[PDB]
Structures are given as structure tokens and as C-alpha cells.
Antibody, heavy 211, light 214 residues
């Protein structure tokens, strides 16, 4: 089927440059009208740039002269090369296919987060939330930037899992909790491990939670 | 530039109810050049309607669109719990491509009281010299809840932070975590740590607590 796989997001300094890639499957980028769309945290959708099937390119006024949209036909990949990045450029960036006639966006990439900040990367401290229906979790504390991914038992336990939105502490670092409810009749036999992955700092922590 | 104004900004309706969303354009937009998107949390927007009234691929019958000129409508004929999302209108009849500000749709389920759990800071965290006490309010509705912290009967202020999950796509409930943060020196010089919860689902506030040395 049709697929759009995005990479390139992460932390970069203000004034810095960063390239995003969007690898297509099931169709050609060269013969299609293609687009980048961004969404600032908690905000609406903003159109960034387009590239026509015939190669013509157009840019939002806010990115003109800083950003370049392009494609590599043989790699079947769409690119956005960004420059002179500011905090206003912090957003989830989406690549999208759209038909030339009406510019509706029928296929979207999964998105990739770009965080424009001068603050240093820090890995999270993972502490257990022990039970004493039983609730148990992991406290993912003091990290920068977003995001962290939390699974339970390598993704085998998904039922009853709540991973909370991160809160910005007064220190400038993020913290969240991930909890799961389980039958207390299984606390003796079943092992519960939270897998906290923070790719910006290469931090990959497995933490066993016990009674 | 064509400005798209969506109304209402927020909408809360029960499952089975009809939902009607509006998108007003500052200039005339040809009917064939208006689209609607559904965006669920942590996901890309998904095309729902294109050309004012045509359904996209894999889109259920309950979604429909209509309108022309400057007034366009998205309708969900019968709301389902999975319809929790933000909905955006979009035009490309004129450059540049513009989006509406979005309509956040909440599913108005029946009152559900929270299950309250309290967590003492682990031993490992104490090594760093900081103590986080976590109060969990699990699977409740509506979103509004009051969480008060009490340390040896002393009502705390300005030393806790709250986080709420996005509305669940199946049971339409929320979960809330409250984290009380104190220094290890302050934590080990107190005994009773309580989390009081006031919520519509509860006839009276519920207090969960623990003793540090118990």
C-alpha cells in the first residue's frame, strides 16, 4: 500500500540547520504534487511548502528564503532542508501527498518532532511506582527534550496502560508517569517491566516494577 | 488570503448524538476545493471529506459534508466514542493553502468516578535527594477534578503539577496524575501523606494516604 516514512527530527540549536526526509512507498514522488505541513505544540496546521509534479516550488511567507523543498527520484524521497531555525519553528512536521487539481492531502507521513532550543540534551531518570486491581507504574523524570516512548513488557502489555503527557517543571526539564492497572492475583507470578526509550539522548532503560 | 473560521471551537456531545461543524470562509471558495481532516492525538491528520461532500477512502457513512460559497458543514450523524478528535477545514481554491483553527470534539459519556491510587517515592529516588509523591486518578468523567495534597493535615500549595491523558477512544474516560515534589530533607521530616480527590462522580471527596514509616 501507500506509505510515507519520516526521519530527521530532533533537537537543534536556534540559528541551526536541519534536514527532514520523507521516504515514499506505493507511489512516485516525482510524478506527484508533494507538501510539508507543520503543527506547533497545541496549535493548528500550518502549510510550509509544496513541490509540483513538474518541479515548481512554493513556500509560506514565514519560511521563504530559509527552507528548501526537494526530492530525490531514485530514492523516491522528499526532503525539507531548513535553515536559521527559531523557537517559532518548533513543531511536528508532516510530509503529505496531494493531487494537483484540488490541494487536498490524501496521504500523510506519521510526523516528526523538531525542537528548536539552546538547552542541552538530558536523559531521564526512571523510578518505579510500586503497588502496595493493582496500580503500578514508572516515573520518567528530568529529561530534555520531548519525546520519550514507554512500553510495558516489550510491548506485550498494552491493556490498561496510561502514559501521561509530560509536564514542564520549573527547572526547564520534563517529567511524566506511565501507569498500568493489573489484577492483583498476578503480582506474584507476572513480571512487569517498563521500557523507557529517549532517542534524543540515546537513553534506553528497562525498569522492573515489583511489589 | 482566504481565512477559514470554524465554529464552534469546542463541542461536547454524547455517543449516538448528531454533531454539526461549521467552516466560514472570508472569500468565496468553490465547492470542489474544500476538505475536512480528522486528527486524533499523536497521529497525523486524516482526510475525511474532499470537494465539500465526497468521502475519502475507508471513511464511514456517518461522516458527510455539504456547503458552497462561504459556508461549509461537516456532519457526524451518530457519534461514536472513537470520534474524539480535532477537526480541521481546509481550502485550496486560492493560494495560499489555508486551514481553519479546528473544532475539538469531546464525547460526553455518563458520569464516572475516579479510582484513586497513591504512590510513595521509591528508595532509589531518595539517593538523589528529591522525593516525588504520585497521586493517580484513574478512568473518570468529566475531566474536571480537584486534587488537594495534605502533609500531616497541612494543605499544600504551589508544589505539585498535574497531567491529564487525552480522552480514551473506547470508554471516553480521562486519567489524571498529580505529582507532589519535595526535597528528601522535607519528606523524611513528615509522616502522613494524603491525596484528597473531589469529583462529580463521588458523593463525598475520597482521600488516599500512606505513612512514610509504615
Amino acid at each position: 500500500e501507500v506509505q510515507l516514512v519520516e526521519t530527521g527530527g530532533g533537537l537543534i540549536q536556534p540559528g541551526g540547520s536541519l534536514r527532514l526526509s520523507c521516504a515514499a512507498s506505493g507511489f512516485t514522488v516525482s510524478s506527484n504534487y508533494m507538501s510539508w505541513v507543520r503543527q506547533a505544540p497545541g496549535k493548528g496546521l500550518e502549510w510550509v511548502s509544496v513541490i509540483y509534479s513538474g518541479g515548481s516550488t512554493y513556500y509560506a511567507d514565514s519560511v521563504k528564503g530559509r527552507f528548501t523543498i526537494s526530492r530525490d527520484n531514485s530514492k523516491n524521497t522528499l526532503y525539507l532542508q531548513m535553515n536559521s531555525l527559531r523557537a517559532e519553528d518548533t513543531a511536528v512536521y508532516y510530509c503529505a501527498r496531494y493531487d494537483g487539481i484540488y490541494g487536498e492531502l490524501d496521504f500523510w507521513g506519521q510526523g516528526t518532532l523538531v525542537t528548536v532550543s539552546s538547552a542541552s540534551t538530558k536523559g531521564p531518570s526512571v523510578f518505579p511506582l510500586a503497588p502496595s486491581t493493582a496500580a503500578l507504574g514508572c516515573l520518567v523524570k528530568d529529561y530534555f527534550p520531548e519525546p520519550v516512548t514507554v512500553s510495558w513488557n516489550s510491548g506485550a502489555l498494552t491493556s490498561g496502560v496510561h502514559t501521561f503527557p509530560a509536564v514542564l517543571q520549573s527547572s526547564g526539564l520534563y517529567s511524566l508517569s506511565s501507569v498500568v492497572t493489573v489484577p492483583s492475583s498476578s503480582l506474584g507470578t507476572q513480571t512487569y517491566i517498563c521500557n523507557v526509550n529517549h532517542k534524543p539522548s540515546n537513553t534506553k532503560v528497562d525498569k522492573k516494577v515489583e511489589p | 488570503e482566504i481565512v477559514l473560521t470554524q465554529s464552534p471551537g469546542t463541542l461536547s456531545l454524547s455517543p449516538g448524538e448528531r454533531a454539526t461543524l461549521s467552516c466560514r470562509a472570508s472569500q468565496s471558495v468553490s465547492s470542489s476545493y474544500l476538505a475536512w481532516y480528522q486528527q486524533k492525538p499523536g497521529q497525523a491528520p486524516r482526510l475525511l471529506i474532499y470537494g465539500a461532500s465526497s468521502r475519502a477512502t475507508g471513511i464511514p457513512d456517518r461522516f458527510s459534508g455539504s456547503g458552497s460559497g462561504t459556508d461549509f458543514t461537516l456532519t457526524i450523524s451518530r457519534l461514536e466514542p472513537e470520534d474524539f478528535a480535532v477537526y480541521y477545514c481546509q481550502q485550496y481554491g486560492s493560494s495560499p493553502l489555508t486551514f481553519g483553527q479546528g473544532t475539538k470534539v469531546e464525547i460526553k459519556r455518563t458520569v464516572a468516578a475516579p479510582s484513586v491510587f497513591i504512590f510513595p517515592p521509591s528508595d532509589e529516588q531518595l539517593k538523589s535527594g528529591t522525593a516525588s509523591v504520585v497521586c493517580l486518578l484513574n478512568n473518570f468523567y468529566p475531566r474536571e477534578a480537584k486534587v488537594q495534597w495534605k502533609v500531616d493535615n497541612a494543605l499544600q500549595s504551589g508544589n505539585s503539577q498535574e497531567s491529564v491523558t487525552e480522552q480514551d477512544s473506547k470508554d471516553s474516560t480521562y486519567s489524571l496524575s498529580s505529582t507532589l515534589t519535595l526535597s528528601k530533607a522535607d519528606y523524611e521530616k513528615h509522616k502522613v501523606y494524603a491525596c484528597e480527590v473531589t469529583h462529580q462522580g463521588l458523593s463525598s471527596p475520597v482521600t488516599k494516604s500512606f505513612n512514610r514509616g509504615e
